[PDB]
Amino acid sequence: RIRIRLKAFDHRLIDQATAEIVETAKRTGAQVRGPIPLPTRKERFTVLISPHVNKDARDQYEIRTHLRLVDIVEPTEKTVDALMRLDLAAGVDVQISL
């Protein structure tokens, strides 16, 4: 029915949000799909660390985007009522489909 995708830069933080969301769907009692770890992304940037000419001296940084999936399939009006406006997750984005 409705599928929830969560992206974050911290895995220790997103797993809390996705477990809190799946718990709230489980506050109806049962029948949740379970979290699904879609493959992460690793953006990478190489920048010169000198302010002038030293090309071989550079640092490389990466931003890891961790991403989970929930995919609630139970059309429970209690679930959607308690899902929206009541998850209250900060630092982690929520998509939720229909």
């Binding site: 190489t46 071989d56 550079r58 490389q60």
Partner: protein, 127 residues
């Protein structure tokens, strides 16, 4: 009634089923000659169970993904090795002594900024 192993080598993964019947092989829904007989990389695929007298006791279903020609050959050979623990490990020593149990972890090195490919420094000059 099938017995399984995975096998991995050089960014390639395999799946092998060792179901016991007459001696034959199928890889990605074809045999070696049409699939893997190219470059005649069939020796390594044959090598484990040849040592274990493959004859007419094993029919093989083989799947593989990733890696090139030789990389997939190493994965299947390693997979067969891990697959041939249904005939109990009584042959594990007789199979490990020749190898095939090491995963062969060696693989490509990263590009190593400042160099050309992971060790190749650019040409140097004092002047």
């Amino acid at each position: 009634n099938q017995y399984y192993g995975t096998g991995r080598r050089k960014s390639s993964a395999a799946r092998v089923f060792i179901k016991p019947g007459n001696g034959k092989i199928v890889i990605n829904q074809r045999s070696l000659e049409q699939y893997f007989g190219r470059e005649t990389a069939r020796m390594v695929v044959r090598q484990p169970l040849e040592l274990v007298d493959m004859v007419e006791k094993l029919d093989l279903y083989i799947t593989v993904k990733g890696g090139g020609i030789s990389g997939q050959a190493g994965a299947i050979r390693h997979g067969i090795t891990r697959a041939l623990m249904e005939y109990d490990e009584s042959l594990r020593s007789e199979l490990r002594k020749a190898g095939f149990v090491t995963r062969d972890a060696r693989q490509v090195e990263r590009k190593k900024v400042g160099l050309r490919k992971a060790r190749r420094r650019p040409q140097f000059s004092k002047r």
